[PDB]
Amino acid sequence: FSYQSIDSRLIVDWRFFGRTEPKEENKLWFSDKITDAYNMPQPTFDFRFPAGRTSKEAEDMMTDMCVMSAKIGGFLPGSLPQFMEP
Amino acid sequence: NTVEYQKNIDKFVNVIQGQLMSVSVPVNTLVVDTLSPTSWQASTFFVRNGSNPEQDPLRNLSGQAVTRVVGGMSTHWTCATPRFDREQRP
Amino acid sequence: MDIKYDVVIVGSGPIGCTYARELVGAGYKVAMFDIGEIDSGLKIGAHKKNTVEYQKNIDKFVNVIQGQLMSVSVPVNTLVVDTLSPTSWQASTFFVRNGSNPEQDPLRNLSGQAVTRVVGGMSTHWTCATPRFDREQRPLLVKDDADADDAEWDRLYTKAESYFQTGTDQFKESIRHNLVLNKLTEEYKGQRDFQQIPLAATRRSPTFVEWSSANTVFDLQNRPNTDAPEERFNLFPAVACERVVRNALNSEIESLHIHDLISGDRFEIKADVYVLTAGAVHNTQLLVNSGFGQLGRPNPANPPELLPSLGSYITEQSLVFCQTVMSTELIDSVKSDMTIRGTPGELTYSVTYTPGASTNKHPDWWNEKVKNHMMQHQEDPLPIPFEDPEPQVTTLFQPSHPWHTQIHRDAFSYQSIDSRLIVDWRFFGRTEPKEENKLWFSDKITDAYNMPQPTFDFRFPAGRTSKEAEDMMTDMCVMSAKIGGFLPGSLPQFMEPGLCLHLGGTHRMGFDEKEDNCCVNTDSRVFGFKNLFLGGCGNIPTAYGANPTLTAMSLAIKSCEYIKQNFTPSPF
Amino acid sequence: KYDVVIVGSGPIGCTYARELVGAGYKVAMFDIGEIDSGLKIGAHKKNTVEYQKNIDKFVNVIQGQLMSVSVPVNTLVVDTLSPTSWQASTFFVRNGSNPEQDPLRNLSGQAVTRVVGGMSTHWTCATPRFDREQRPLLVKDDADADDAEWDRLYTKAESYFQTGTDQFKESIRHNLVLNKLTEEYKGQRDFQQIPLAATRRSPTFVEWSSANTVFDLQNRPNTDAPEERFNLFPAVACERVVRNALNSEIESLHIHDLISGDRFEIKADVYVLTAGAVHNTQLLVNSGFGQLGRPNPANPPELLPSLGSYITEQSLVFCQTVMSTELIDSVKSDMTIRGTPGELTYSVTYTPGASTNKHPDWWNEKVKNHMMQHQEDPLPIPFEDPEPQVTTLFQPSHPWHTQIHRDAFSYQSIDSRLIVDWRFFGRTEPKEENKLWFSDKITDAYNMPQPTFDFRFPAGRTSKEAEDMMTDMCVMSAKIGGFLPGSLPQFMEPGLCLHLGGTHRMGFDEKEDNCCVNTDSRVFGFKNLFLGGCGNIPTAYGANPTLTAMSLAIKSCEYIKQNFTPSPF
Ligand SMILES: *Cc1cc2c(cc1C)Nc1c([nH]c(=O)[nH]c1=O)N2C[C@H](O)[C@H](O)[C@H](O)COP(=O)(O)OP(=O)(O)OC[C@H]1O[C@@H](n2cnc3c(N)ncnc32)[C@H](O)[C@@H]1O
Ligand SMILES: *Cc1cc2c(cc1C)Nc1c([nH]c(=O)[nH]c1=O)N2C[C@H](O)[C@H](O)[C@H](O)COP(=O)(O)OP(=O)(O)OC[C@H]1O[C@@H](n2cnc3c(N)ncnc32)[C@H](O)[C@@H]1O
Ligand SMILES: *Cc1cc2c(cc1C)Nc1c([nH]c(=O)[nH]c1=O)N2C[C@H](O)[C@H](O)[C@H](O)COP(=O)(O)OP(=O)(O)OC[C@H]1O[C@@H](n2cnc3c(N)ncnc32)[C@H](O)[C@@H]1O
Ligand SMILES: OC[C@H]1O[C@@H](O)[C@H](F)[C@@H](O)[C@H]1O
Ligand SMILES: OC[C@H]1O[C@@H](O)[C@H](F)[C@@H](O)[C@H]1O
Ligand SMILES: OC[C@H]1O[C@@H](O)[C@H](F)[C@@H](O)[C@H]1O
């Protein structure tokens, strides 16, 4: 699950995954009016990563991937360090 | 687990993408102002193309998707199966 | 800086310079103000393309243009950026950011519209195309006498062409230009006629063209000077003109309020005559900021009392665009008269032609250029010389094809294929004036110069404008195919509304303020006011497809005749 | 006939003119480009009201006057042409490309500016001093005397450029970034304002310095300088300096007037080349110094064998960040806020002069007023707050220069107040195999030998440090906020930093130091030929080199004043 000129033998993927504090306000709810392709109540999210520890860890995580990955090689242009879509 | 995918692993990304159906897509507000003057042109950002008008685009999990096939997501997953240490585990 | 002048001009674009040329020449004590600054070099207001370096590197001038096109009205951005780090500050709403205009409906905008604040205005970067309008595109200057109307326009356009040094033969020695011109002529035989774009430009050498500008019109030097010892002219750059002060009677302007942007001070300036030539957008802003028309979101419940048509009936052209890659048949035809022996790079390789042979398809000069290129550059696979000037071709607007056309190479692009093969196609539509198409100004939001923020409420009219626009696209597709296929990455497309920068009708001309729904008369005098004149493309009230500047200059010359006949120059 | 001819009207040529016109010499200067900054000749193009109100547009002006040095033949495959279009059979030389250039050993980002004032008409104006580790020796074996020499020259160079470190002190964004970084490094690194060649005129306008600041480029004699002699000749391509048979003296400058097309042979007592690191080397090689053509070690050059060798260009890493929620909240830490913005009950207050406030009154007054007058806006930073201009200078333990700032040369939906640029610049070891050379067959747009690079960042310390530098940017930036999507941490194209050095390098001894000019910037063997610019710098440096170049130029002018007499007026 990628997200062609450099030889593939040289390429390494780095994925670092954070932990998220459970918070009552982070919700999955379902429309009483809008329906999905199967005529079921449409799923809706109301989500943000919690401030405090989740957010501080997430950024520390990014830094750590940057620090660690450098021991193996530089970044591949077009695959630079990034948060992926939530 | 086909001979062909394992000789052409760069193409399996497409199998995954073909079976990840987005959970909640907000109403699209991209401005397309280079339509020809004869084409039908929207006056508002109305609910189009399966979008969910209930969804705040700024409070979403836009990447969340589901897989409807026998075997579910295990028909395409990366197969990583670590244990949780006490700190992560109920 | 004095307090009192005979004439004050707002803006140093080519239309402002038309007034300066005519009135400074007739002995008036003239002051001119520009909100922008002198940057073009020692020739004040000159074309920025007129350097040796830009003409050896023409691909880089696009950046000069882009650096001085400031968008008119940018809507509030609603792009979703959901990959910020969790620690970054993250918006809860699409709030007003980065200079955007919350009054602007993104779906009823002229997003491509932009302005240029520098001495010489847009003429410091323009493409210099200056066609005449035919009767179908042009406002009447004489009623009920078509021949007299045609005679008056011909007199005015002749003088405007002289001012701009308009010509139609600067590109006559280009191989590319003639290859494309001749092919189109042949393809439409007895249906349409093709010619060189009329261009405000003077060739200086086979590789350098002196493109015209405001500075060609009037050189913008302060006078008196050694070469004009009885003339009086002062240019004042970095001066924001903010208001013309009306009397209570709305019969006369009493002063011009200016903001010196270097010192920060504000001053009143007095003149006998006031000329506003700040562009289509900024003339209208200045007038609205001064009590003309209506400030704020339009309200038919409360029509304005002064100049009710100001900012209404605005027109902007539809523009279609593509690039092509010259056909193999055309490239082969360039070298049709050559005899070729051997293979390039070999000691006996030979490319020859017979000068004067009655069976040649090309003149001797053409064949000499080809033969020399092919012999001096045997590594190169094209018969076209490296220095060959670009094509500059048009078929002008006609009733059976009611759009202007440019078949050319524009510095304002929108690298692997050889440049000699590439031709630009731009076709420009005419837009019906409609009361509902408006330029208005916020009563709350202000621009970078703390002036009421311009807002558009615009769509291309249904009916004829829209049908023509699409027919126009089809025509560019049909025509361009005679020359070559489309260039990948420059496929046929409508460009962003307003990118063509041909906005008209924002302070439009007519015979009668009420019956013609207009703001100025045929002398460009604002109805009701004795000493206030507007110049520029905002004056044009018709649906036009051709480039408007020459038309606007022609109306300015007519305005100057009224001024010279009704106001007396002070004694020196 | 002139006392002194200078080639190039950049800031380094202007340093020679300032020193030498002032000392009474009859000076001519030539530039291949034209006057195009307005009536202040060679001034910064950013010093218009309109650019400083629309700063996002100035990147275009920069791009418009960066002409690539060496572009390799294009091999992109376009296979979706119509069947009727002329379609190439090979990847032939198209569109100004250089066939001599290996695309994989280039400095593709390298570019030159042909305008009067040169690159100083658009530059960023960062003028740091080099510390001893980055800096060439002017005195050997006496560090104190070396330090005193440099301190003197750099002080004079700062005066010419009007360098200051205070122009941004009233920016909230600047202070927010600086204070956080100094807190986080617990004394291990010092943060300060980038030294900038600029004078603030108002809270919303800075007069950026340029060549014009150094020397106004007006012909003399004039009313202001009735006893001085200076003539500027723009649109004049300088092509060769003519050597006597002894290779001890230059006898003439051959020029090409681009407007008339004519060629002339100009005589001077003293010849100064200040045409840039690329174009100084081009002119010298077109004159019989060094070696013309592809390097050929079997036929070593007779004159200046080190010319075009030991070239250095810096590694550059870049990203942008979006300010952290914690920092933005800290802006308003002294405020008492009640109610909801937009409603009648809403209020923002602070106590003036309270000793427990984190910020001074100016800051709190700005933030209070912004918050009460613009209740539709969700940020506590005023609209017109100036940009950050922060650096921690190169040190043995972090051997790179840093800029934490807002550059006009970027590389929309997020509020600009939140955005900060990061540029970290590495030092590059001089190696004899890193070369700028000139084709013996291919010519450029001025009919001069086409420049060609043969460059790779040296393995060993340069490469280790480049990667350590990238990590350091990633670690430091994270203290301020996360990366801005679309401006992720990356290496920029080689040479886009435009810090090229060592192409005509300085040393004490031509042979032992593998160099071309002495510490007076005089070409070895030649009595009356001097070079100025970043080409003279022989060391591995990471800071912006112009100030150091200017300092060497002042020293060169001193030599000239000690050794040549001006003609009587
Ligand atoms: C897509 C994917 C998934 C994962 C990885 C990579 C990518 C690209 N890699 C990965 C994963 N997990 C790991 O632990 N290690 C990794 O390396 N991925 C996630 C993993 O694949 C899932 O966590 C796991 O399948 C979940 O198993 P499940 O709880 O059994 O759920 P599924 O989604 O697999 O199957 C659900 C199932 O039910 C069906 N369905 C849905 N709605 C209905 C209704 N109303 N009626 C009847 N049936 C229903 C679906 O069709 C489906 O098959
Ligand atoms: C940018 C451009 C423009 C055109 C072409 C190409 C492109 C990329 N090509 C072209 C054009 N027109 C043609 O007929 N043929 C073509 O090939 N272009 C448009 C042309 O350039 C304009 O139509 C013409 O300049 C308009 O002349 P103008 O009426 O004199 O207006 P300008 O915008 O040139 O100058 C206005 C002037 O006033 C100043 N200003 C604005 N506001 C104020 C205030 N409040 N105070 C004082 N001064 C003000 C501006 O700074 C400016 O210089
Ligand atoms: C473009 C750029 C440059 C700099 C920064 C940012 C950007 C986008 N920022 C910057 C720089 N330097 C710093 O120390 N701090 C910063 O924050 N930039 C580099 C700086 O701008 C240059 O180092 C400096 O100008 C070099 O000065 P110079 O040695 O005087 O050289 P120039 O390139 O400025 O001027 C040379 C001059 O000579 C002309 N020329 C070239 N060839 C000829 C020939 N054959 N005959 C005649 N004249 C010639 C050029 O036209 C030019 O004007
Ligand atoms: O997009 C602005 C346009 O203005 C028109 O005047 C020119 F003719 C076009 O070629 C183009 O430059
Ligand atoms: O005046 C308000 C406060 O400002 C802060 O910035 C100072 F550090 C305090 O000492 C105090 O002066
Ligand atoms: O890429 C050119 C660079 O020049 C450097 O000197 C500046 F410091 C950078 O900000 C950048 O503009």
Numbering used by the authors:
A (entry chain B): 454 to 456, 461 to 543
B (entry chain B): 92 to 181
C (entry chain B): 43 to 456, 461 to 618
D (entry chain A): 46 to 456, 461 to 618
What text does the study give?
In this context, Trametes multicolor pyranose 2-oxidase (TmP2O; EC 1.1.3.10; for a review, see) is of interest since it can oxidize both β-D-Glc and β-D-Gal to the corresponding 2-keto sugars, which are intermediates for production of D-fructose and D-tagatose. The reaction catalyzed by TmP2O is of the ping-pong type involving a reductive and an oxidative half-reaction. Therefore, to evaluate and compare the productive and competing sugar-binding modes for oxidation of Glc and Gal, we used crystal-structure analysis of 2- and 3-fluorinated Glc and Gal derivatives bound to the TmP2O variants H167A, V546C, H450G and H450G/V546C.
Based on the overall more similar kinetics with Glc and Gal, we expected the V546C mutant to behave structurally more similar to H167A (and the wild type) than does the H450G variant. The C1 hydroxyl of 2FGal is exposed to the catalytic residues His548 and Asn593 in the “wrong” configuration for a productive catalytic event. Moreover, in V546C–2FGal, the interaction of His548 with the β-configured O1 group of 2FGal pulls the O1 group and forces the pyranose ring towards a nearly planar configuration. Why then do H167A and V546C stabilize 2FGal oriented for 1-oxidation instead of the 3-oxidation mode of 2FGal? A possible explanation could be that H167A and V546C are unable to stabilize the α-anomeric form of 2FGal. In H167A and V546C, His450 is forming two possible hydrogen bonds: His450 Nδ1– water and atom; and His450 Nε2– Arg472 Nη1; which positions the His450 Cε1 atom to face Asp452 Oδ2. To achieve this, Asp452 would need to move closer to His450 bringing its Oδ2 atom within 2.8 Å of His450 Cε1, which is too close to be energetically acceptable. While this could explain why H167A and V546C are unable to stabilize the α-anomer of 2FGal oriented for oxidation at C3, it does not explain why the β-anomer is not stabilized instead. Possibly, the answer lies in the tendency of these variants to distort Gal towards planar configuration at C1.
